[PDB]
Amino acid sequence: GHMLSKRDAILKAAVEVFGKKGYDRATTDEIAEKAGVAKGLIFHYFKNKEELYYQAYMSVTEKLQKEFENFLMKNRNRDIFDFMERWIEKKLEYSASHPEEADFLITLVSVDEGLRKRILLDLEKSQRVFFDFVREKLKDLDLAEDVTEEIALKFLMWFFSGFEEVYLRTYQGKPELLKRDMNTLVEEVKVMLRILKKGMTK
Amino acid sequence: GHMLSKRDAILKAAVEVFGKKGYDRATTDEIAEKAGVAKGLIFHYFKNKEELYYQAYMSVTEKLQKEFENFLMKNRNRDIFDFMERWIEKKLEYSASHPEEADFLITLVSVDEGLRKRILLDLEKSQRVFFDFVREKLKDLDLAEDVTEEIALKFLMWFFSGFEEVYLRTYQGKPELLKRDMNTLVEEVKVMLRILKKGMTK
């Protein structure tokens, strides 16, 4: 019976403690105890706590990216609002089923600005897949002749990404509550995208 | 030539260091050096760093509340979207002119959950003034017969409060950039509220 590589064990423990305590409050002593490794092995694979946080972050966002690209490739031809609605439903389900990953991702706010910036630069190339897709699909739309593709794209991304942020924070450490509110959230999201569509297009 | 009371000097220094470093990284040693007081006087007026953060937070949100209630009392009779547009313009101006307060307020995310929760409970009574006002003005509207006052109010507050959050973070430590982007931001905000209005109402 094979176990996790020592690297993946550290990363899973990292995802857990960081998510619980936050970056600043978490200790690599604790992450190592939790991983069932000697304090010094964190140093071998990672060098320092900042680098641990960073690889942990890339490792989780890499998982998410694969999910997304599969979804993209299957639902590419959909109407852009239908696309987003469906995608949000899917992220809602991931989050309730992967609460430790969820709690961890939302910790990106509380890290020193230089660490956070590094992550967003190294992440820009992947987040631009969804961004370029929407920008593309917006061309197939009848935009209200006071609304720029720029404003539409801006509004749409901000709805999409702030919604993520709002529920992750509201339901941090409370997965069963998210699950209880799932159906309502999905229906609220539906109407909201229908408001954007209507207000946004001719 | 009278100076700040020692309490207000501590609080102003608190607002500055917390805003710079964040709650966890900031030290009360540093706040006291910065305030030109002995390390022990923080303890006399405040007891601990958590309590310092909390009074600092109440003190800044108390300033904001007075601004808001004056604005409310003058612009009470406006159309609710016109009201919000104007209010956002005003908050944009405050923030660029009071960048240290701005940077400080956005630190509420990175504090331990129990401190953050305390602040939001003690703050609920004041934030409900704006909330109850909007809820009230929404009754004077022709809501699209798939849109509940609940969803409308939810969408409107989330636009309003996430916009605050987005610009505070985007322009953290960069007041002259906010000022440069002011006019564009105000115009983007205008169109976005016009999209909500249109999508939201008959």
Residue of B nearest to A191 (CA): B147
Q: ∠ CA B36-B108-B51 to the nearest 5 degrees?
A: 50
Q: B73: helix, coil or strand?
A: helix
Residue of A nearest to B153 (CA): A192
Q: Residue A115's CB: how many other CB atoms inside 10 A? A: 16
Asked if the C-beta of B161 comes within 8 angstroms of chain A's C-beta atoms, the answer is no
Which distant-in-sequence residues (6+ apart) come within 8 Å of A68 by Cβ? Answer: A87, A129, A130
Asked if the C-beta of B155 comes within 8 angstroms of chain A's C-beta atoms, the answer is yes
Q: What is the domain partition of chain B in residue ranges?
A: 1-48, 49-202
Q: B107: helix, coil or strand?
A: helix
Q: What DSSP character marks residue B122?
A: H
Q: Would you state the torsion angle of the CA atoms of residues B5, B11, B12, B18, taken in this order, to the nearest 10 degrees?
A: 160
- Whether A155 sits inside 8 A of B110 (CB atoms) is no
Asked if the C-beta of A36 comes within 8 angstroms of chain B's C-beta atoms, the answer is no
Q: What DSSP character marks residue B109?
A: G
Q: What is the CA radius of gyration of chain B?
A: 19
- Whether A192 sits inside 8 A of B151 (CB atoms) is yes
Q: Would you state the torsion angle of the CA atoms of residues A122, A124, A125, A127, taken in this order, to the nearest 10 degrees?
A: 130
Choose the mutation target among B190, B198, B201, B202 for the interface with A, i.e. most A CBs under 10 Å: B198
d(CA A77, CA B136): 42
Asked if the C-beta of A144 comes within 8 angstroms of chain B's C-beta atoms, the answer is yes
- Whether B194 sits inside 8 A of A146 (CB atoms) is yes
Decide: residue B195, CB within 10 A, 0-12 exposed, 13-18 middle, 19+ buried. buried
Residue holding tokens 């002011």?
B182
Among B146, B158, B172, beta carbon nearest to A166: B158
Q: What are phi and psi of A201, to 5 degrees?
A: -125, 165
Using an 8 Å CB-CB cutoff, list chain A residues near B148.
Answer: 191
d(CA B51, CA A81): 46
**For residue A59, what are its two tokens?**
């490792």
Half-sphere exposure of A88 (CA within 13 A, CB side): 28
Q: What DSSP character marks residue B86?
A: H
Q: What b/e sequence results for B127-154 when a residue is b if at least 16 CB atoms lie within 10 Å of its CB, and e otherwise?
A: eeebeeebbebbeebeebeebeeebbee
Q: What DSSP character marks residue B23?
A: T
Asked if the C-beta of A157 comes within 8 angstroms of chain B's C-beta atoms, the answer is no
Cβ-contact B167, B178 below 8 angstroms: yes
Residue A8 identity: D
Using an 8 Å CB-CB cutoff, list chain A residues near B147.
Answer: 191, 195
d(CA A90, CA B171): 32
Q: Which CATH number fits domain A49-202: 3.30.465.10, 1.10.357.10, 3.40.50.800, 1.10.3720.10?
A: 1.10.357.10
d(CA B34, CA B191): 44
Q: Which residues 165-194 of B have a C-beta within 8 angstroms of A?
A: 165-166, 169, 172-173, 188, 191-192, 194
Q: Is A201 left (phi over 0), alpha (psi -120 to 50) or beta?
A: beta
**For residue A178, what are its two tokens?**
């998210």
Q: What are phi and psi of B201, to 5 degrees?
A: -125, 165
d(CA B181, CA B185): 6
- Whether B110 sits inside 8 A of A192 (CB atoms) is no
Resolution (A): 2.3
Please state the three-class secondary structure of chain A as a single string.
Answer: CCCCCHHHHHHHHHHHHHHHHCCCCCCHHHHHHHHCCCHHHHHHHHCCHHHHHHHHHHHHHHHHHHHHHHHHHHHCCCCHHHHHHHHHHHHHHHHHHCHHHHHHHHHHHHCCHHHHHHHHHHHHHHHHHHHHHHHHHHCCCCECCCCCHHHHHHHHHHHHHHHHHHHHHHCCCCHHHHHHHHHHHHHHHHHHHHHHHHHHEC
Asked if the C-beta of B149 comes within 8 angstroms of chain A's C-beta atoms, the answer is no
Residue of A nearest to B159 (CA): A159
Q: Is B4 left (phi over 0), alpha (psi -120 to 50) or beta?
A: beta
Residue of A nearest to B23 (CA): A110
Q: B120: helix, coil or strand?
A: helix
d(CA B202, CA A26): 51
Cβ-contact B200, B138 below 8 angstroms: no
* Cα separation values, A39 from A17, A19, A26, A57, Å: 15, 20, 14, 21
**For residue A74, what are its two tokens?**
């299957």
Cβ-contact A10, A42 below 8 angstroms: yes
Cβ-contact B51, B122 below 8 angstroms: no
Residue closest to A31 by CA, chosen among A46, A54, A12, A45: A12
Using an 8 Å CB-CB cutoff, list chain B residues near A155.
Answer: 192, 195
Which distant-in-sequence residues (6+ apart) come within 8 Å of B94 by Cβ? Answer: B64, B67, B101
Query: Minimal Cα–Cα distance from B22 to chain A, Å?
Result: 8
Please state the three-class secondary structure of B139-202 as a single string.
Answer: CCCCECCCCCHHHHHHHHHHHHHHHHHHHHHHCCCCHHHHHHHHHHHHHHHHHHHHHHHHHHEC
d(CA B28, CA A22): 21
Residue of B nearest to A147 (CA): B191
Q: In the CATH scheme, what is the code of domain B1-48?
A: 1.10.10.60
CA torsion sign for A44, A50, A54, A59 is positive
Asked if the C-beta of A112 comes within 8 angstroms of chain B's C-beta atoms, the answer is yes
Asked if the C-beta of B22 comes within 8 angstroms of chain A's C-beta atoms, the answer is yes
Q: Is A110 left (phi over 0), alpha (psi -120 to 50) or beta?
A: alpha
**For residue B17, what are its two tokens?**
């260091």
Cβ-contact B161, B134 below 8 angstroms: no
Using an 8 Å CB-CB cutoff, list chain A residues near B141.
Answer: none
